[model samples]
Target chain A: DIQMTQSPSSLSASVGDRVTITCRASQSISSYLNWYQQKPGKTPKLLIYAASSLQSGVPSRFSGSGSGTDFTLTISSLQPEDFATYYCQQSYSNLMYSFGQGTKVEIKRTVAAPSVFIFPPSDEQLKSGTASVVCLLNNFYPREAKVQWKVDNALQSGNSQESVTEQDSKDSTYSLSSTLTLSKADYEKHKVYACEVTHQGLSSPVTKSFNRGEC
Target chain B: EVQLVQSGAEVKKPGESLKISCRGSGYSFTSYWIGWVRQMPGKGLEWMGIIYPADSDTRYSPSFQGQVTISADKSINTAYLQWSSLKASDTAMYYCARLRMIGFDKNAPLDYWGQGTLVTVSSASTKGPSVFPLAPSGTAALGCLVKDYFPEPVTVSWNSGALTSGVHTFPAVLQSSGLYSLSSVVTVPSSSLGTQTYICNVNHKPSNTKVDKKVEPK
Candidate 1:
């Protein structure tokens, strides 16, 4: 059996751009190679077979070439749906077939700034000696963001917990939420609190502030 | 509409016996190839072996050639993966799947898969210290016997400093009470044995255990 290695573990491309990925075999395997594309949260789809033969229903833009120990998978003009990971497999041996580590093709996406929604405690909750402020980061793309909290403009520690990023399978977008808890004494002493969201798409952090209520 | 339904999970001790089933439906069971795949706990899929039910022809991955037996019954539209003696390492999820091909295309990937059956072989099932050195002839035969080891598919090798070709290993045979006895033979010129020393090594890969026995001239 032969081993396969793929180059350029990841790449950034834009619509209508021509993108190519390469895979090399440890030994000569003729044209016994295959290619597949795997979009996030979906099963992989076969793209090419026998090294260069396009799979029955795959698009013409997705083509494969090369033989023996080297092969390449090229996308002539990248489509919006083409941003996903790709893999190369070999059928050179019946004893043990092999697959190359996947190469991810990421589209140039504008990282969306997260929208923070603050849910302040109600009057009954404030009277109970404890309250919680929930910060919801709504409908963000790319899913890369950081959450921070401050009380009276001073950094607050051990008072916040963030949920796992939730993905929008329909559009490949994401959202998340973080909660900040406050004691009755701290709520009375602090004039205001804030939930700060930092995104790669923004030059500065986006902050949502809330004023302490007099119950 | 084709589908494969597999047997339920199993738990057994080392040296214990087991046989799991996979029944096919909604297709011509005898016309296509039926095979078994194994996924050890937290490990990737491994194609153990496959059988053609029409003629009962079978092929095994070298790693699984003798470790487990693959069989089928065309009349019942069912296939099986059986172990005479279970090992702790045999604890894995086994899936019986249909290969995507008209005939036995060795490179055909699986098109459909059955739900997995998990088998767990756990316990201290190691027993050995038995060795046999047979008389040398034109072809020298060396045998090593080990007993009561579970989670098998152990590896046996013969080494005497520099190794030579024409060496053949026989499969391990299951013994009564869930134990196993294994052997290996090497073909060497009878004249070359007087000055050389040969040792047999038995390795239980999952257990990190090794047993070595030196062959003494008779």
Candidate 2:
């Protein structure tokens, strides 16, 4: 199966505006694609199916186009109610299924800033001499935000992993979580590890830090 | 309205064996793809692997390729993630979810999740721990495959006395019965051999064990 990567993590617009989000399949996905709209705190509702088929009762203003590796979902005329997160899903292969991270549509409000959280390792995790650190980005809007981890103030490259953006169904706000796996030797360094988040809403990055005694 | 219900929590000793399950309901279980996710306490979710119950096709994350086993049974509408020898590090919560799809598109996020199964592999017990040599595939290309190992994660490095540039190690994967496997490739000038031997070293981190394969210059 092909991996589906989406773009424009987020966008801000006013009512009556136009917006489009794109999803690129690592390989040809034929026309076996679908589009959905998820309002704050709700299950996603199907908007377009099979690349261009509008689901019954959905506004005709919502549309989709393109095929193969490149596909797009467009809102010809954005409405107040259209302010929500959008996702593109593929069913082109029975081998497996995956989804685009998600593109959120926010009203031109100050992008809801993100708050960061760093969790302490569990007894079992700490006992094993391999500690797992989690960074949480909370209450961010526009759904498009980037989270990066740094060890002792230096950017971490390949030793960590991140999860897809998770939207709060009720508020339409977004949050993301990331995990950094390190050996006991590294964690014992008592080095300062920071979780820095960047979003269009803020002029500077928001960061949360964890030091040796903290974890 | 699709749903995934996973099994309950478990506690076991190192070297002990286990198999946890996720059962799907409310939809055509066989028609969609089911995947396993892992969340060590205080950590984010890791997408381990996925399976198509209908045809039994499976795909694994490079990080999870051969570390564990992922399988599904259509008759029972369930998917599974099983371990042959538990490790203290393997203690984590596992969730099974349904990957949403329509028609032939299989690239959808998991829309539904099972509560979660917590597995605790006791730290007290001891755990223990492949190789193909790199040879020319083309004028200046080389590749090799390493198979059969345990405790999941491992690293591979290429040494020819010095760090050989352009050597790439592909992601290690898991094989059937819960073991690790991996491959690597490199390119070198045919004349660069110069009586020096290229060696591939497989390092199993958890066990602090290393295995090496030597490729003498031809």
Candidate 3:
């Protein structure tokens, strides 16, 4: 079995950008190509097999059409839910199979869909004897996102906080933020916290780790 | 959906031993085969081998054929992959897979894969049906005899007892009634009481022979 070579280890695309991944087999495998999507800590869901046969339940915009030693997995229009890695697998009739290294798709800054800015805390972002923590999220898509600040493994509910969300951003992406405040006891024990993105289709929540900025 | 979901995240130091498991579901437990594959950290996959629940038939990949042991328990519908020793490189996500059935038209590609068990083998936790055949009846007491037929001596025995050398006669054929019965008779020294332990023997290789030690009277 020939090895599969996947290029462009990483790529950046905008909210509505079209992206293509090319997987070429060493030798012709006819139409036995397959595609799958894998997020960290999950099993790959088959996207396409036998070259262009779409696995059931896959979105119509996600289409594949290829043959011989070449194949392509194309996303018609990128959606916020589509910011993840994709892989291609070639299956021979026998037990032999090969997978291409994943392509990491990140939101391109050019899309300027929406913008969230992390306000730079002053030189004294933290008072020398005081402690503080916060989480900020901006420029996300699908508009129906919720951001909560978690500290030292505990959910901070209704902590005195504020948010100014705008639905009328000229950019294609949506932006939002969540800032947190806590006491010395909360900041002393834990050095790290995370901002988790919970949405439909996620097997488990997606967590982005954070830490208190050094004053 | 009888699922083979496994526990998450195992961490180990180099040179320690480890093992991972794969379970099955959605079909008859005994009807299919399960296998394993190895994926190096950030690399493609490698097929290990498969274990059959019904007959216990197994075939391993030439690469992993000897590196791991693959076994199955039909009653439980589960299969295992184990290693006696460990290496730092052994750390990787291991997935359990189902052999694609022909009806699914799903080619040889593994149709199903487990959520994957992460085994950091730097350290670790240490470790059919019946078809019957009938037996034939055997009347005991068979032969022992030695004869100098040519330049060599041949030995035959009935229940470990040797036969006396003499003119032996046997039936050319046999009948239920006394009309025609191929018979044989042997004559030896009458005073030889050591022959009291006379025996009968049968040899099927050179030819089929049936002996009646009790002396049948017509």
Candidate 4:
């Protein structure tokens, strides 16, 4: 295998965001993608391997999914202490075993903001129309804000999906998760709801959208 | 059931001396190997060395060669990561992990880990991180250790890079936690950290300083 590349270059994951890291090998390396966590100066800690198996003692919230040439490291519930750089390693070749650069997570901020939303993991049996969104409100503050309902790009006038926010462990930092329910018509006709996370730190809002379909 | 809980955080002035420890409790102290790992503030982890408390067998990450000393007291069942002098860049968390099995393989991932001890290496010399040394010679210091064989622990001695007459002595400080920390004046000075190299000869002797000619070009 040539090697692997991580996307978003870096990311912002709060306490509730279904944070994900994508690692793509230059070519298929079987199921060799491994996930590791690295702070500033320490060695990387292995979290997920062969793409999904959780290492012993690691919290359940941390998990790895996807296989073959593509793999994703998903942490269902992000924790305050979980803030750091995460990398994906390919242990296939003894000659050139490597790790993904990383994805950085911090608290959401105040002032001008990015259109952000933290959707709870599917495992969470949320109310029919409710969605959870968590944001980081600490360092790397941004200044700007614009979030609303859109039906085919057109902003909805009477739509209502209110949000709430709060702080994490450290005094200055904050983590905000919000939920909103939609009427069947509003949700289906406008099945694609995207939380545009935009701010100074981000070149553009990280938009996450999904639709409900029979499996 | 013995446990090894690290002490509180430590802060130091650059160039000053410092040492943190991992105290073992709950189980027999010398039953396994104790290792030290360095984690810069908000950074990844780096293995510094491993020490066998029973017979005091030790190994350093070559990079940590002359920078510090590793020792242990079988009676106390405690291991140490010592630095004669400290540097600012050395500021980071240190963890104590248990090597349930040693010599199992030359390179194996650690099994059990302690909470960790944090040490901020301050001062001028500790400013930049140093790279591990290439194979120094062939005289690697090796000692065979069983689960519990003690009394006169093993020893390691070092001479000048040029094979001088007497061995170099690095000063070490004993922390209340029973681990030793020290600060030896910088033997090599550099205005720019980019261009610096120090060779640390590790492994067994007689075969002192053996290079894997098959793997390394030199």
Candidate 5:
């Protein structure tokens, strides 16, 4: 499977302003790239297919170009309704389909802060040795949350997140979680395990930690 | 409005084959897309894949490509998630949902969900035992927390004839984690505890393996 990375994950644009979002495939994909538009509380809509062919019903002002490893989606004149998230996807890899991180186009308004929670394993799991700790992010918006971990006060890698960020049915807010899996020996060996989260809405990252005392 | 009815909970041994179903109603089942979601114990929800029941056009999350199978039966209006052979890690709740797909867009969100099905894949046998001394009561007693095992009966006996009358062996109790837990007790003469070493022999049924764990008083 190929990796899809989007640049300018988010941007601030005014009405009638021209904006462009770019995505790069890990390898050549010809014209397999597609673009989508997702508005708050609405299902995502396909905007471009085969890299540049406009999907029926999408405005001509919304266009896409490029092939192979690089692609770009451009909005010639940003409309009021264009204040939404845009995503690029690839169907080139027969193994599976892949999607870009996403690009948010907005007017740069106030921020909505996110909260972090760390839930430890159950008592039975704690006693059994093998356990998992969950770090959940709640009420976050703009689809810009990064998860990192710290073990024994030292930064570590190996981050595993859930399938996708869930959006609330009644609101535009979103939620997602990442898990820290470890065995009993590893759990006891560490003094503290922390989950760190960075978001475009926050001036500083928010974090939470878990330890054996909760067990 | 759409309604999805899922299968009942399942309890199967590891390495076994299994299939679960979800039936959709109250809408055009053949036209809409049905998806499956997974939520494991102590973890958040995960999207397994989606299947268009009309023609069985299926798409899987890259993370779940080869792990399991997702299929549908248009004639029966049901979608299925099946495993050729299950693993203990595959023990989790599986949900069937309908995607909010407008004609041209396949990458839509889930709009309707079914009551999840919990699948438990348990293995027999367990780890060794650890002995923890009880408070200093008149009777010198120590407890051995043995095997938090499952799906099989077990026998607990003290090591070497050193254990006699004061032994208490508890029956297997179902635990919250969907497994069985058992603890055996042995009471020794308070003075002999200083020089005597005690052991807990946990024997499993069918597997027929004897695991001996010994602990000396502190």
Candidate 6:
């Protein structure tokens, strides 16, 4: 399956403001790039696809460009419900089920950014020449959040999730759980990796670095 | 749509020079691999050798090692099998085919066979020494190994289509087969790259031609 990664994890925009989301594939996936808009508790809506073709009945404002490994999705003028997470999917293998972690769009002036933390994989897992780590974004305002894996600061494109809101008796806001699978081959090269969290609630992104030794 | 089209048949006299070809099409002719086969009258097919049309990487079946010469013309999508002197015993129905090799091995069959080129008579010329392209063993620092070669290699260089920024070369060590084996490497920061490719080079033969082994990032 082709690995797809979209950029600028979270962006704050105005209704009339233009918004763009880009996806980078691990390898050439041709013009199979697809875009979708998903909001809290709602099914994802296809926006633009096949790299740039606007789906029928979709607003004229949504446009796409770029082919091969690089692709872009743009909202010429944000509309109602435009403040939702944008997802880029690849269908090189006939839409074989690989989806981007997504790029979140929200109205300006959001609440607190999620508190991000990274947990290392088990030593046993590391010894098998394979490893996995979990990432968490604790209770934050608004449910939209994204998790990305970066090795030695190189943003990775695949694997990993979302959020809740409201004042609950125990806790309010949103939280999510994410896991990253990897080959220890990547770790043997270096132990520095980061769990990058982007949420509309923050001024700057929040991240936590994990070292293999800490597992 | 990959294809391996063997050249027309030939009838040569004893002690005469003979060269046969197999032109590839319908795919990345250069990247995909090719190997030649031979079957004498009333005898089973024999593995002549294997070659990469793109890089002129040629290797022989232990049985035909030095008995046959294998090479490729990169400018054109063609493979060459030759002989300096042809003998009656050399009479055979020669065939060439494309192998299903992606990484670096021959255990796989040549899924598609080129049209048969029947050579009724004589054969051959030769290579000074055998050259086997180095394949990384587990952890090679991007291992580009040159093994089973007679006489130490004359040169070794690594490139990413051009000169590699940095490279490492190791001295030759004699293998159990008594042939000198050379090991060279091209190491770059794993973190500093985003799926790139590098090729290893070495010329052990006097033909002034070198074999290229591609090293692709996974």
Please give the CA lDDT of all the candidate structures.
0.70, 0.69, 0.54, 0.49, 0.70, 0.63
Clashes of each: 4, 22, 20, 69, 0, 10
lDDT of model 1 at residue A9?
A: 84
lDDT of 6 by residue, B109-163 (tens): 3456676777765232222333333222112234354444543335777663476
Q: Model 6 chain B: which ten-residue window has the lowest total lDDT?
A: B131-140
TM-score of chain A of 3: 0.51
The interface root mean square deviation of candidate 3 comes to: 36.9
* Model 1: CA > 4 A from native: A8-17, A38-44, A78-85, A104-107, A117-135, A147-172, A177-196, A206-215, B1-28, B34-73, B76-218
TM-score per model (chain B): 0.56, 0.55, 0.50, 0.52, 0.59, 0.53
The best candidate in terms of DockQ = 3
Q: What is the C-alpha lDDT profile of model 5 across A28-136, one tens digit per residue?
A: 9888777877664344566887789887778999999998899999999987778888888776766655678788786643456766656555446568676556565
Q: TM-score of model 3 relative to the true fold?
A: 0.51
Q: After superposition, which runs of candidate 2 have C-alpha atoms over 4 Å from their true positions?
A: A1-3, A14-17, A35-49, A54-62, A76-99, A110-215, B6-20, B27-64, B72-76, B83-218
Candidate 3 structure quality by residue, lDDT tens digits, B60-107 = 766776677887767777777877777767777888777654533354
Full ranking by DockQ: 3, 5, 2, 1, 6, 4
Off by over 4 Å in 4: A1-9, A13-18, A22-53, A57-61, A64-72, A76-102, A107-215, B13-16, B27-31, B100-103, B121-218
Model 3 CAPRI quality:
incorrect
Show the lowest summed lDDT stretch of 10 residues, model 4 chain B.
B142-151
Model 3: how far is B111 from its true place, Å?
4.0
Supply candidate 4's per-residue lDDT for A42: 50
The residue-by-residue lDDT of candidate 2 on A98-173, one tens digit each, is 5677887877544687655565444444665766666655556776778788888888877765544334435556
lDDT of 5 by residue, B1-218 (tens): 56899998787878899999999989989888887877675343456788888888988888998888999988888999999999988978887878666674543445567878888787643433322222222345554554346544567777655576655555544444555645555556778777767777777654446677665543
Query: Chain A TM-score per candidate?
Result: 0.64, 0.57, 0.51, 0.53, 0.54, 0.52
lDDT of model 1 at position A43: 37
